[PDB]
Amino acid sequence: GKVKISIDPLTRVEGHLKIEVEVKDGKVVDAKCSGGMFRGFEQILRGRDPRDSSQIVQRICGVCPTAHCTASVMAQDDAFGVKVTTNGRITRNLIFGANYLQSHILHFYHLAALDYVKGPDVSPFVPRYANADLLTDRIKDGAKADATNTYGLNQYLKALEIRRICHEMVAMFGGRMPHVQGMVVGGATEIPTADKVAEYAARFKEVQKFVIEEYLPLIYTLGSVYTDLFETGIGWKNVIAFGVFPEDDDYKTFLLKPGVYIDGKDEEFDSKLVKEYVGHSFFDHSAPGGLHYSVGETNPNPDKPGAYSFVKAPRYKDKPCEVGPLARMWVQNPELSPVGQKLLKELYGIEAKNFRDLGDKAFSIMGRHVARAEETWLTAVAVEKWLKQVQPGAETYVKSEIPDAAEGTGFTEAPRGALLHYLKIKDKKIENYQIVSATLWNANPRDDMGQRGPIEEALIGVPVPDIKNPVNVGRLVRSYDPXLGCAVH
Template sequence: MAGCKPKQAPAAAVAPGKKIKVAVDPVTRIEGHLKVEVEVKDGKVVDAHCFGGMFRGFENILVGRDPRDASQLTQRICGVCPTAHATASVRALDDAFNVKLTTNGRIARNLILGANYLQSHILHFYHLAALDYVKGPDVAPFIPRYSNPDLRLDPKTNQVGVDQYLKALEIRRICHEMVALLGGKMPHVQGMVVGGTTEIPTADKIVGYLWRFKKVKEFIENEYLPLIYQLAGAYPDLLETGKGWKNVISYGVFPLNDEETEFLLKPGVFTDGKDYSLDTKKIKEYVRYSWFDDADTGLHPSQGRTNPKPGKKGAYSFIKAPRYNNKPHEAGPLARMWVTNPELSPVAQKAGFKRMRDLGEKAFSILGRHVARAEEAYRVAKAIEKWLTEIKPGAETYVKAPVPKEGEGLGLTEAPRGSLLHYVKIKDSVIENYQVVAATIWNASPRDDMGQRGPIEQALIGVPVPDPKNPVNVGRLIRSFDP
């Protein structure tokens, strides 16, 4: 497992019943800055804290600017999934500008975001998580790494994993080209704007996207998915580890009709074992344990404020704690696939699972999250195949809309990592308030005002740590969320 050694690395075996703290700082092979501290007793995690140590402040940067700047600037929040921030931002602006997309504009946006989804999922497994299970050669980027005795793949399968790691770099490049064909460039697409997209899809561009896409689809079906299920077979205990709260949330993504009432991956909530319709009014952000002003706790994003208070007593993160109906909810591929419960790939069906919920409790686990992500990549690829037959060469993808003097908009989508919300309020034709509830904020949040752990913190409880010097399973669990 490539990454930094934990700051506290006891040299001797820990006495039974004794608690020790192990800090992994930073958690490597993730996108962004994260420290995780776990308390270990009798070889298992008994408590956990996620520390988000970076204040970004994009909400404050946007105040007073032209609203159309938002979709460009907020993409800089993340270099891995900028198209998701672009999508949430333009959806908020569409709402505030009261503009309705053309059919071609809707499909073009889906193709841009869809290509980035495939790139992101392939990136996550191969280049961020696979080295938790696959042993590479003793050269960078495969080293430095923890001493990991728990590598169970036979030499032949392990070599397949290493070969796919390298091939995935090329597949990701192809996905970036697909995004750039319709979005202008990647990362940070220029062509996704309020009212649609700026690039008219010509026949040449559609064909160029298609032949690139075929290579990506073949990789997902013939290499990515089979390897994931081989891992699940080799590590059955990791299908029982890291369950967390087992509450999930999805805003819905990839609209299938122009009214945007139907989605490829549906909006919905699963709380305490029951399904519910999504009600955005029930989303609130808490900051008791975050370095933000306590006066702004428990607010819906439309009333939200971003007032940092570094050094606040009792706080330990620059991540806020979003909650749905006052309860923690996991976001991401597992959440979307659980809510939608679609038919799975032929690889899954061969293994005896027809739909996502057929996995039952195993879905809420370290490897269950990897299975969900790979299956979602398969589902998005099948949808892209259909959208390529629906998009019309030369048809308009953009509807011009003047900047309103006043307006308010809510933009919901799903980043590859989870539920993403952008909110904008316009006054005197400039941004008066802008709020972002990013995907990883759901999962890597600290405790809330009620004392409830965030989803990653909760999922870490019970994770085995036989060797505190090499907390392999802690890293596996964190990366399964793709923070």
């Protein structure tokens, strides 16, 4: 009595995604995640001036280009042997941090929320699933249903302007957005002025107000209606984080620290243990067993028997691990926002001080949205601080020369999860460039040993009581905020 459901395109994610599930007795019993578009940035990059990479790589994704730019310039800093100044480090954090706010807001509202909020009766808000299990369906008190839906929809609409303001903030020291000009090997290209810091701060305060007063309350309210969605979309419960937003010049300390949590245990992150498998991916590897990214190979093969995705399969110590706000917030275990502490008590009867106090609820559809909203607040607190630390007039750029032969790796966290760029230089040109990038860790296919990727695994057990309206499949997938451009590059 199994039924197959195939969803292609899985919309309201970035890029080209197919999801296939098998449903039996009202639950998903198997799943496959497929990325269907390939460009091959790692091939395109070969033979170029290594400095070009921080422009080229941004075109992997127009939603998170600052993350790729950050990883690239850090790889170049490493390979070129140059140390960034204090003000360069802070300026890079302000450019990138403004897009963290943009990205999370864009995701929750403009990608995720139409699985919960009933939009106006015009395209692109319709057509939609006939039985969509929305706020207007769930809340049985009709006036409360209308009021809550309108509350959510008005925030969706306002968030269009808030996310645009976040890009004004990115452009302030980044030049423009999408695709900044302001980050390069050696630091940042424009020294912040007192006036421009103040202009960034004024916009930031408006974004921060929306985060605290509108976004956080909506997420906690939404979860209080969809309590069942804290109880499904579980998955491996393995997470990894690389560290993001260095808080000192030697990159020893971060806003959100590196770490790994596997099978209920915390461990340190060791980059030597990252490798990629391609048994079910459209790629050929010269040797069996998975490849560390420092010897990564990008030889596309859409005819590979048994393969079903252009996404490779990264594993850590041969374990599937997921990434993103859930991962970072679990690893760091920061104190929850005052709003979160209050609304968890008021709306759920939950006493919680730190992120891990959510327990099992963290590893779920709603847990992922909560992690993302809380991280948006946490990032805003950091930006508010960096705005006081940044020094008008202080040098942000240090000169460098392209080395003949070198290697470098840039480690960061994209808004969607752990990101590194590995750069190998020979004869002053890119010899190899290997990208291991956020959604790659989430939306990957099975490895050579048949272990499902995190989204695939998290789909197992998701309720599908109505096969014609399988709304929880998309809800699970979108809780991960996938970027398939990033996943495949």
